[PDB]
Amino acid sequence: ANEVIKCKAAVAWEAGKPLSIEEIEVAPPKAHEVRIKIIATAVCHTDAYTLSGADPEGCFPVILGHEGAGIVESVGEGVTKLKAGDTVIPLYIPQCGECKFCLNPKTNLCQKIRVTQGKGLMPDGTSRFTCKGKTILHYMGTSTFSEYTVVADISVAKIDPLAPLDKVCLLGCGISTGYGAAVNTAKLEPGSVCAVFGLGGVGLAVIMGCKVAGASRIIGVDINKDKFARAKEFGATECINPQDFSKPIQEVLIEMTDGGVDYSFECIGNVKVMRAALEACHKGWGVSVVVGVAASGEEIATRPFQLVTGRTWKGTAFGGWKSVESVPKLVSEYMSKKIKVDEFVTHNLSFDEINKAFELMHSGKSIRTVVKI
Amino acid sequence: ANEVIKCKAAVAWEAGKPLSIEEIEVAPPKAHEVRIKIIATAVCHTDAYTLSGADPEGCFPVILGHEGAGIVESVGEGVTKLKAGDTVIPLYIPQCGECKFCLNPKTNLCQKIRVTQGKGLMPDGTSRFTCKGKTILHYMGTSTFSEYTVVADISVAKIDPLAPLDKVCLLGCGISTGYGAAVNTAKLEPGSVCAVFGLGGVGLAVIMGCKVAGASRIIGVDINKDKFARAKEFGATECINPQDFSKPIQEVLIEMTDGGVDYSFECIGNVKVMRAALEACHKGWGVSVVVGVAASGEEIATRPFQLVTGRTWKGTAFGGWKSVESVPKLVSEYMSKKIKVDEFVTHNLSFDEINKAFELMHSGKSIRTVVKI
Ligand SMILES: [K+]
Ligand SMILES: [K+]
Ligand SMILES: [Zn+2]
Ligand SMILES: [Zn+2]
Numbered sequence: 152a153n154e155v156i157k158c159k160a161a162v163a164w165e166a167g168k169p170l171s172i173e174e175i176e177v178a179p180p181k182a183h184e185v186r187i188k189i190i191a192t193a194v195c196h197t198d199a200y201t202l203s204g205a206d207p208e209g210c211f212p213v214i215l216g217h218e219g220a221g222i223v224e225s226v227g228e229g230v231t232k233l234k235a236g237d238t239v240i241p242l243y244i245p246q247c248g249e250c251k252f253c254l255n256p257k258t259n260l261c262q263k264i265r266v267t268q269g270k271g272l273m274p275d276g277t278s279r280f281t282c283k284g285k286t287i288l289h290y291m292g293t294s295t296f297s298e299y300t301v302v303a304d305i306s307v308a309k310i311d312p313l314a315p316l317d318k319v320c321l322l323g324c325g326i327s328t329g330y331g332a333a334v335n336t337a338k339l340e341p342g343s344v345c346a347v348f349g350l351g352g353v354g355l356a357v358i359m360g361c362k363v364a365g366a367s368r369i370i371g372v373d374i375n376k377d378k379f380a381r382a383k384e385f386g387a388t389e390c391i392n393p394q395d396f397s398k399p400i401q402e403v404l405i406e407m408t409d410g411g412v413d414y415s416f417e418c419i420g421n422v423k424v425m426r427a428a429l430e431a432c433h434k435g436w437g438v439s440v441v442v443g444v445a446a447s448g449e450e451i452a453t454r455p456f457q458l459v460t461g462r463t464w465k466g467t468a469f470g471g472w473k474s475v476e477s478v479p480k481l482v483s484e485y486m487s488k489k490i491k492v493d494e495f496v497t498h499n500l501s502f503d504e505i506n507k508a509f510e511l512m513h514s515g516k517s518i519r520t521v522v523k524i
Numbered sequence: 525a526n527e528v529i530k531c532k533a534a535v536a537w538e539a540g541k542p543l544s545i546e547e548i549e550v551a552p553p554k555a556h557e558v559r560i561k562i563i564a565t566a567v568c569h570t571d572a573y574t575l576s577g578a579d580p581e582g583c584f585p586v587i588l589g590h591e592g593a594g595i596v597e598s599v600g601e602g603v604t605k606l607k608a609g610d611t612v613i614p615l616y617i618p619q620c621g622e623c624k625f626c627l628n629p630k631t632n633l634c635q636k637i638r639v640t641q642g643k644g645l646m647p648d649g650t651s652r653f654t655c656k657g658k659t660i661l662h663y664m665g666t667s668t669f670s671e672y673t674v675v676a677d678i679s680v681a682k683i684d685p686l687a688p689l690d691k692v693c694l695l696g697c698g699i700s701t702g703y704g705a706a707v708n709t710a711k712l713e714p715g716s717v718c719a720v721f722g723l724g725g726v727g728l729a730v731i732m733g734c735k736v737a738g739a740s741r742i743i744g745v746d747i748n749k750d751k752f753a754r755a756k757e758f759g760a761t762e763c764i765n766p767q768d769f770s771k772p773i774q775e776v777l778i779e780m781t782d783g784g785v786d787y788s789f790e791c792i793g794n795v796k797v798m799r800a801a802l803e804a805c806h807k808g809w810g811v812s813v814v815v816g817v818a819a820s821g822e823e824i825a826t827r828p829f830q831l832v833t834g835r836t837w838k839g840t841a842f843g844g845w846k847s848v849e850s851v852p853k854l855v856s857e858y859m860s861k862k863i864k865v866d867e868f869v870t871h872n873l874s875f876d877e878i879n880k881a882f883e884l885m886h887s888g889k890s891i892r893t894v895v896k897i
């Protein structure tokens with residue numbers, strides 16, 4: 152029978168502090184749960200946001216991480232679609248396929264287990280993690296910063312067994328989110344003129360998506376010009392640094408596109424840039440998609456005139472992908488060379504050096520650092 | 525040859541004062557212009573707004589009015605599509621049919637004459653109105669509060685000769701705007717749950733559109749319960765007065781619809797209500813359409829979280845209808861009984877009593893007052 156597993160995990164004991172590599176215990180999977188051996192994981196801006204303590208919903212102690220890939224170690228009772236050995240990717244956006252959201256083609260926001268997930272617990276209201284006599288919380292239903300994690304059986308995507316996990320773990324959030332923002336949320340048409348604010352992992356994926364969709368122009372926008380080279384490699388036709396201008400960035404974009412862009416994407420999480428992204432859109436048919444997650448309490452604003460005269464304000468979560476059915480297809484698109492993933496990896500580290508990944512992100516030198524468990 | 529015409533018109537010499545019935549001179553139609561004999565007109569909230577003086581770009585003196593219907597009296601050089609005797613409706617939203625906007629299926633905001641129109645002038649930068657030696661400005665390119673008006677030849681919809689002008693003049697703005705907001709901007713699907721804020725002419729037209737689209741639930745929202753009866757007559761499944769609840773109206777609507785509405789429409793021009801309308805929308809797929817025009821400088825706001833979790837913020841102008849090609853079709857839908865127009869008329873007055881139409885505006889079980897020229 153499935154026994155308790157003693158392994159290593161990067162525990163976040165408290166907000167504002169680095170992660171600590173600890174010996175933890177991972178309980179066996181209960182009914183409709185799956186225990187996964189994490190092979191590779193990466194750090195997303197969101198993991199850092201929660202660790203900072205700025206997240207009102209953040210609770211400690213906790214095992215963070217939501218971009219990962221591994222192998223099913225064991226399954227709980229009732230689980231038949233998955234078995235030991237299956238290659239998988241943990242999902243923070245599950246897909247029960249039965250709730251009103253899963254049944255509605257216009258959304259991917261399954262609500263079946265959100266309450267418990269928000270509390271860092273499995274669907275039955277308890278955690279499978281313990282460390283030095285203390286209960287350790289789950290995070291985003293995935294907790295990938297551990298040699299072994301337990302997730303709800305609806306939070307699992309079974310993928311191509313030949314997929315390189317040290318690469319597809321990135322489809323766990325960043326890449327999928329930006330890519331989906333373009334082809335799912337915006338559904339931009341061939342020839343579209345697009346602007347992408349923020350040239351990090353998500354922004355690059357948006358550009359990637361705009362290129363796949365056939366955009367005629369893709370303008371990258373970032374104050375850090377060191378991000379331009381890679382942005383162009385991904386498809387950006389040109390990049391502009393807001394600091395090189397003495398007028399609001401939206402005015403710059405309107406000027407260089409004769410009215411504004413057809414589609415804009417904010418991939419930073421800055422409400423001011425969000426307003427700018429909307430206002431840089433063309434009158435009559437422009438559409439701006441909010442992809443980044445802004446700090447709590449912060450509000451976006453603009454004059455209703457902007458909407459009345461034709462612009463549309465949208466947002467997206469995990470690129471609008473119905474997770475369980477989509478993630479496997481995204482992996483296949485990677486395997487068939489339709490989308491890029493390898494190009495997103497700028498650094499590689501061992502599990503013990505996971506804090507360097509946070510350091511590299513904060514310093515803005517990297518796009519994605521893959522951590523080998 | 526076309527002579528100067530001496531006729532009656534309701535002139536607004538200054539803001540805050542009643543319109544004055546004056547005897548004016550209407551110059552003949554210059555190149556690509558059309559002089560129309562106005563048979564019937566009505567007052568829209570926008571006319572009242574401009575007259576109030578609370579409008580920054582509102583100039584004086586001016587001949588207001590933009591909801592009208594009449595007959596072509598004469599046309600200027602180069603006009604071949606229209607001729608004396610044609611039955612028409614003046615358009616504040618043109619359709620030159622050649623600009624980037626007119627050629628784009630996603631918008632109806634022709635820009636060919638926007639600049640001159642905003643200045644109360646014809647395309648050539650001059651006005652065709654004079655009174656007591658003073659030049660009188662045009663308004664919204666229509667100036668229907670006159671026995672005769674002159675408009676750009678692209679601001680004309682040629683309609684069914686059998687149409688009752690004392691009725692279809694309302695298709696000049698109010699009805700068409702609300703109706704189009706539902707079927708063009710929202711494009712709501714059968715069975716949709718809707719909420720309409722503001723139960724005036726525009727609001728009722730939105731309700732009408734929701735019913736035509738097959739909406740299942742249509743909740744009218746207004747602080748004036750006197751507007752509910754007619755709202756139900758037009759199709760509202762129920763009406764609620766925000767003042768009857770302690771909780772913010774969006775929370776009330778979310779509770780009533782188990783999550784929020786599929787589509788909301790703000791038909792008041794209040795940024796606070798626009799925010800409530802958006803937040804009253806269901807997670808994952810809710811859409812809110814701003815139909816009302818807010819006061820200058822005022823802005824709408826919300827937490828980006830609302831968009832990231834699936835809601836969309838939109839707006840509309842004249843219901844998104846390509847004016848010249850759509851108005852004739854709308855007249856035909858009225859003639860074939862697909863939509864209502866007669867039910868919007870709550871009062872009838874003579875031209876000299878036009879000021880009462882404005883008095884009736886500031887309150888009531890009054891929707892539209894048709895002024896017989
Ligand atoms: K689209
Ligand atoms: K729709
Ligand atoms: Zn993430
Ligand atoms: Zn579900």
Ligand SMILES: [Zn+2]
Nearest residue numbers: 620623626634
């Ligand atoms: Zn045009």
Ligand SMILES: [Zn+2]
Nearest residue numbers: 568570697698
């Ligand atoms: Zn109007």
